[PDB]
Amino acid sequence: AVTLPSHSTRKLQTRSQTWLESREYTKHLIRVENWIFRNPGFALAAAAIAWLLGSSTSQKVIYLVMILLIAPAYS
Amino acid sequence: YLTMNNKHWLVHKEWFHDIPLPWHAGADTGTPHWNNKEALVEFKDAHAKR
Amino acid sequence: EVQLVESGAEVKKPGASVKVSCKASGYTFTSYAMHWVRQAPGQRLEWMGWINAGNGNTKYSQKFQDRVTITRDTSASTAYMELSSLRSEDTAIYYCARDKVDDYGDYWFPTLWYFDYWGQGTLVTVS
Amino acid sequence: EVQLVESGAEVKKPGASVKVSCKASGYTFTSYAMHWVRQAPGQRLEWMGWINAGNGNTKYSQKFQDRVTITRDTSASTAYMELSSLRSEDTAIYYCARDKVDDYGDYWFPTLWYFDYWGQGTLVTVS
Amino acid sequence: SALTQPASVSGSPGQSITISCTGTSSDVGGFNYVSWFQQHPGKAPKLMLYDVTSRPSGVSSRFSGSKSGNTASLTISGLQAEDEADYYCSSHTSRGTWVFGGGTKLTVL
Amino acid sequence: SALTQPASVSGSPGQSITISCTGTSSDVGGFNYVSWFQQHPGKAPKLMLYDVTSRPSGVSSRFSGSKSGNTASLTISGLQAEDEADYYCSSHTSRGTWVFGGGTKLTVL
Amino acid sequence: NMAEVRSYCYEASISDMASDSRCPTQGEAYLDKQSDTQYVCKRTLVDRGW
Amino acid sequence: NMAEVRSYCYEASISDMASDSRCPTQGEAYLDKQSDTQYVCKRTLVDRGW
Q: Where are the domains of chain A?
A: 1-75
**Method of elucidation:** cryo-EM
> What are the structural domain ranges in chain D?
1-127
CA distances for C102 relative to A16, C31, C110, E33, angstroms:
62, 8, 7, 16
Closest-CA distance of chain B to residue C12, Å:
38
| Angle ∠(B42,B48,B50) on CA atoms, nearest 5 | 60
DSSP-assigned letter for residue E104: B
> Cβ of B49 and G48 within 8 Å?
yes
Give the integer Cα–Cα distance in Å for F69 and D126: 41
Total residue count of chain C as it appears in this document? 127
Give the integer Cα–Cα distance in Å for G8 and G6: 6
- β-strands C123-124, C92-95: how paired? antiparallel
Task: Name subunits touching H (3+ CB pairs < 8 A).
Answer: B, D, E, F, G
F42 vs D: CB within 8 A: no
Total residue count of chain D as it appears in this document? 127
Closest-CA distance of chain G to residue E59, Å:
23
DSSP-assigned letter for residue A69: H
Encoded amino acid at F75, one letter? T
Total residue count of chain A as it appears in this document? 75
Q: Are G and E close enough to touch, i.e. 3+ CB pairs under 8 angstroms?
A: yes
Q: Helix or strand or coil: residue B43?
A: coil
DSSP-assigned letter for residue E27: I
**E strand or H helix at C47:** strand C46-47
Given a contact cutoff of 8 angstroms between Cβ atoms, the answer to whether D80 and D56 are in contact is no
Give the integer Cα–Cα distance in Å for E83 and E76: 9
Beta bridge partners of residue E104, listed in sequence order:
E87
Q: Helix or strand or coil: residue E62?
A: coil
Interface test with G, best of E51, E94, E98 (most G CBs within 10 A): E94
Give the integer Cα–Cα distance in Å for C4 and C7: 11
| Assigned fold of A1-75 | Helicase, Ruva Protein; domain 3 (1.10.8)
Given a contact cutoff of 8 angstroms between Cβ atoms, the answer to whether C45 and C39 are in contact is yes
- Both ends of chain H: CA-CA distance in Å? 64
Task: Name subunits touching D (3+ CB pairs < 8 A).
Answer: F, H
Residues of H in contact with F25 (CB under 8 A): 26
Give the integer Cα–Cα distance in Å for F95 and H31: 7
Nearest to G19 by CA among E94, C110, C109, B42: E94
Give the integer Cα–Cα distance in Å for A67 and H32: 51
Encoded amino acid at D122, one letter? T
- β-strands F8-9, F105-106: how paired? parallel
| Angle ∠(C67,E103,E82) on CA atoms, nearest 5 | 130
Nearest to A73 by CA among A35, A44, A47: A35
Give the integer Cα–Cα distance in Å for C54 and C32: 8
| Assigned fold of C1-127 | Immunoglobulin-like (2.60.40)
> Cβ of G3 and F29 within 8 Å?
yes
Given a contact cutoff of 8 angstroms between Cβ atoms, the answer to whether E34 and E52 are in contact is yes
**E strand or H helix at A50:** helix A41-51
DSSP-assigned letter for residue B9: B
Q: Helix or strand or coil: residue H32?
A: helix
The string of DSSP letters for A5-43 reads: TTSSS----SSS--TTTTTTGGGTTHHHHHHHHS-THHH
b/e map H10-30, b = 16+ CB within 10 Å: eeeeeeeebebbbbeebbebb
Chain F residue with Cα closest to B27: F26
Give the integer Cα–Cα distance in Å for C63 and C52: 19
Nearest to C66 by CA among C79, C54, C48: C48
Q: Helix or strand or coil: residue F20?
A: strand
Give CATH for domain F1-109: 2.60.40.10
**From the DSSP assignment, how many helices (H) and strands (E) are in chain C?**
0, 8
Name every residue whose Cβ is closer than 8 Å to that of residue C36 and which is 6 or more positions away in sequence: C20, C22, C47, C48, C49, C50, C68, C70, C81, C94, C95, C96
Q: Dmax of chain C from CA atoms? A: 44
**Interaxial angle between packed helices A41-51 and A59-70, expressed in degrees from 0 to 180 and rounded to the nearest 10:** 140
DSSP-assigned letter for residue E14: T
Give the integer Cα–Cα distance in Å for E93 and F6: 58
Give the integer Cα–Cα distance in Å for C34 and C50: 7
Nearest to F67 by CA among F29, F27, F16, F38: F29
**From the DSSP assignment, how many helices (H) and strands (E) are in chain H?**
0, 0
Given a contact cutoff of 8 angstroms between Cβ atoms, the answer to whether C34 and C55 are in contact is no
For residue C116, give the nearest of E47, E90, E100 by CB distance: E47
Name every residue whose Cβ is closer than 8 Å to that of residue C24 and which is 6 or more positions away in sequence: C3, C4, C32, C34, C77, C78, C79, C98
- φ, ψ for residue H48, nearest 5 deg: -140, 160
Give the integer Cα–Cα distance in Å for C28 and H17: 62
| E46, burial (CB in 10 Å: exposed 0-12, middle 13-18, buried 19+) | middle
> What are the structural domain ranges in chain F?
1-109
The string of DSSP letters for F39-92 reads: E-TTS-EEE--SSTT---TTS-TT-EEE--SS-EEEEE-S--S----EEEEEEE
Q: Helix or strand or coil: residue D100?
A: coil
Nearest to E87 by CA among E11, E35, E23, E51: E35
Give the integer Cα–Cα distance in Å for B27 and H27: 9
Given a contact cutoff of 8 angstroms between Cβ atoms, the answer to whether C50 and C60 are in contact is yes
| D5, burial (CB in 10 Å: exposed 0-12, middle 13-18, buried 19+) | middle
